[PDB]
């Protein structure tokens, strides 16, 4: 009954914004998200299904992650337009619906409901932002067409539109492929990656935070429901990680480089899809969401429009806590011990090796070592001499958020045997 | 069965449209054609598997209408002040 | 939209040219352009006798023409020192107020038709037709009547004018109350 | 339901109507003086610029049309409940009421914001 | 069947070719409306009647009407302006279209299905219990999506 | 095809056009108001076939120039006439239109026949509404081929059928 | 078409051709009658000329319409300019066969109607969209943006009220349970005159159909006296005549549909004569509508859009929800009679202040 809370708050605030100041509307949105998260906690171990809508461990964990990312990205945004919060609420409900169902068509409806408000949230009205929004909308509608024809071929290969049906040979394979195309585009996997660098570079940094956390979480949640063949999985992972890290090498801008890094990270997470453990993936995504939200909150404190690499430098001298947290996030995204990003990486690789994919796992690891070049060129740049760069050292809001994110990262890296025991039913 | 093959053909036609068209609006139109090809495949398979693909396609139509509304609003906002819609005119974002 | 509402089209009464600078459903600014009816009275009259000019006065404001007639007659009377008989003065005020009623009728009919409905034009024009029958009775002309003179009026009223004028003065209060 | 024969009769109806329309067009086009002239072909209103050069029209029409597509989708969903009503009981009534209220809240937002714009 | 069925399928394919070929936006849209009409006729032939009627009403009656409104507000009929022609891309696009058709043709080839079910006409009389029922949740999600789309477009234009 | 090349057909189409004469007023001065009086509920040009009144010039055969035609209005009226369907006729109402009238000066065209091919002339200042009806019956029987001048000659059905428009 | 037979295809074609040419003669002589009824309204009299009753003047008018130099304006789209009138005319002509003019066989053996499709109101809605289609399309093809703007005004207003038509038509479907005109008519035979139950829906359908060029938006627009309307101002001989013809056929189709749907499509409580009562109700609505044409002003289509959008369509959906509650709980059918009577009393008492 968390979806009920989400829908009630969205519909109410829609009209309430006429009599309420946008600040009051933002307060209301924050309260609703926190209350939904509290309900998710109190329902831990209470799987609940009504229709095709189903809340299980996966729904709980991934919607927890999405709610966290949405709370963080809303905290930063102070625009006096309550619609800029209505859209976030809509996207949150849509991603919950996406993660909580197996019905392909309801999955499509949830996809559209979560994706449309992001297209509008990508409009700071900066000229690049319109180009980004246009590329995003066009490629997203194309992928929606592909996913819909895949659902049709699924309904062709089997009498139902719900995943798990037995499935035919080549036609079922074709339907599975046509669903995987859209799901990977939404997960920023190569060779469907081209939109991600442009969109991350064009969209405002807090929005990109929201995206790179909640969108990736819900996307991998829905991916776990598919029975993706190992050869297709191998191809996606290889291309994604290779192109991501390589093209990230060439990037001069922090947001675009992070987009390519996120392509490589989606490639990594796609390994747990071999077995679909979802405990390994739940943990991985917990760590990655925290780290990326941290990094993008810092990038938002630096500049919403665009942050170059040199802007990151001197961040320690400016704010030591911010410099240290940014370093920790870069390391957790590199996947290095003793951090929870490393534990998520290890769990995904363990699922992959259990699936018996060796060459693919090796290539992923090589490309991950390649990623250390730019991961260090970001984390260590914090200590360089401050060049001319705009710096607004955040509110205690964002300071405490970034600090708590880094602390949770390191704590679950040191003792994953605390939360990892309850990513299943939740004992 | 001819209907499902015809739907695949219409899908390919809409793909060619999306690739060839210079205008965002005509790209979106080709996308709508792809969506309707999918709806026809759904209707054939609903005739096969008992009518659920009909309600499916209905929901699909509703979703298509919503996304059309949103995308046309975006197209207008991007090319109201700006000149010719040609999508190659926006190349600022590069690798 | 610098839109050109042309002369006589679309159904802009009183032929006029308009450059409506306008975006949307508002009206930003109308640039008027006139001169399509310029006949040159101020020049042609320099080459006509004072008596002849009484044929030129009604034809400019052709709805309330007797106001033109009266203004010109009075100005010439002042200039050359003329004495107007009291009965002629009474007749002149009656004709002026009658042409005033005719002009008011035509104005309101044209407005209601211009925006609104067509129907109420016909009642106003029926009362105007009664007024024009009065004008034919007295002057032999509907409008552009050459009746006023520098001394006074051309000739006296026939017997039949006063009964028909009382008829119209009795029917008119109810009629104007109906329009209201 | 209804037989397909009435639908074939519907096709016949359309064919007859279209044939009659084409006949009328042939008469109108063939019977004429056919003296094209430059000023005759000129669009309207005395030399140039009936509309002339004006920039893109108001988006008010776009707004009306988009509103219309969404509310027409609404009506398209309301029709199956309109036919199958008594069997769906209070539960179907409540579901359709929820759907209607959601789209009417959307309408109320767009109205209190208004489109004179 | 096949006599008029082949006719209807040829009309559908030709209308799609027109909508993707013609450089006049208005002409393409009109080809697409013809496509939707032929497709609703095929729907009716496939016992889906209410769905064909809604395809005419919403898609043709409303959606492409809004499309026409947009392209008439912003003339854009002669699309080939600002070319960046990339002539090499036309044969590559034709190639990609042929391939996306061939892979589906392979997936559906040698595939025969039991098209024998008594839909009883895709009437709303029989579709209602499915829509409000098993599909009631999907319906509510769709309605929420529509409301969100209204608010999205409204805040999206909103000059200020 | 202009209503010609059959003995019965041309008389029938002339009958039709004569009774279906579609007036398009080109109001200039007080002649225009005296023509508006030819439509009121005492004497209506709404019986012979002139009930409807389409302000557009693409929709009427009869062009009634009612008032003084200022030289600045001449090209406008010229193009309104040229922008008419071809089986079209021209009536010149009042003295200012027919001749220069009492305004014989630089401002007013001294014969509207200078700019548009005039079919019928109707003197008067203003011409009585019943004189205008006499003129339209005159034009009616003219397009019926029942019109003759003082010299004995039958008059062609349509003037502006005899001019090298350009 | 549960209970109704089907005539042979040749007989359906014959009936279709008959209905089309009958709509021709109908709109022509109804133009005569509207001219003369307006003339009676404004104390003048009509054309006692070329008739006797004026009934040869439409012949003279058509004879003028042909030979009238059908002109194809340069700078206008050569194909679309010609094409748009055919669309506007065809989709106005059709959708009149559905109207039952009698019990089955009362066409002297075969069928009062042409087609009795199981889903009727959806057919009506779809073909109603296509009139606005033709309107704004001709507005574009005219190649004059002056006309285009009026076409857009037209399209906006007509589309608004055409959407309202659906929420208006929802209510009687709940009661009848069928989308066939004959079934609805027979329901009105049994329980009686569905408008007695659905008066608010009757009103909103009336006011919506008024926006379909009937009158009082009157910023439809017509080219006269405003920013000109669409679909005209560039057509000369036959295509302009076709536009006006289709607008009138839609007018009379709505004037026929109103009694067919809400009131007692023919099926009178007494004397049950097949055609005459339907034609009389058509004539009644036609005369009332002409009264409106004469007697009421414009709306500027801004007030018209405001009114339709804010008042008519919300009211129609509210009444639809009330009727849906009633049918779902099925409690009596008497509650709807009481509710419509009380609603009429309310919407009436607010006038006489
Ligand atoms: S002839 Fe007389 S009535 Fe006509 S415009 Fe001239 S002045 Fe006026």
Author numbering:
A (entry chain N): 1 to 427
B (entry chain K): 1 to 95
C (entry chain 4): 26 to 205
D (entry chain A): 1 to 117
E (entry chain J): 1 to 160
F (entry chain 6): 16 to 181
G (entry chain H): 2 to 354
Paper text:
Complex I (NADH:ubiquinone (UQ) oxidoreductase) is the first and the largest enzyme of the respiratory chain, catalysing the transfer of two electrons from NADH to UQ, coupled to the translocation of four protons across the bacterial or inner mitochondrial membrane. In bacterial complex I the 14 “core” subunits, necessary and sufficient for complex I function, are shared equally between the peripheral and membrane arms, together forming an L-shaped molecule. All known co-factors of complex I reside in the PA: the primary electron acceptor flavin-mononucleotide (FMN) is connected by the redox chain of seven Fe–S clusters to the quinone-binding site (Q-site) at the interface with the membrane domain. In this work we address this question by building and analyzing atomic structures of nine different conformational states of complex I, which were obtained by X-ray crystallography and single-particle cryo-EM.
Crystallization efficiency and yield were dramatically improved by adding heterologously expressed subunit Nqo16 to the purified complex I (which contains sub-stoichiometric amounts of Nqo16). Structures of CXIINT and CXIMJ states were very similar at both global and local levels, differing mainly in a slight rotation of PA in the CXIMJ state. With the exception of this rotation, both structures share a high degree of structural conservation, which suggests that in practice both of them represent the same conformational state of CXI. The observed differences may be mainly due to the crystal contacts, possibly restraining motion of PA in the CXIINT crystal structure. Indeed in the native crystal structure (CXIINT), corresponding to the CXIMJ state, we can identify many possible proton transfer pathways linking the MD core to the cytosol, while connections to the periplasm do not seem to exist in this state. In CXIINT or CXINADH structures the distance between E32 and E67 is too large for efficient proton transfer (~3.7 Å). The two main states of the complex are shown in green (major-like MJ states, represented by CXIINT, CXINADH, and CXIMJ structures) and blue (minor-like MN states, represented by CXIDQ and CXIMN structures).
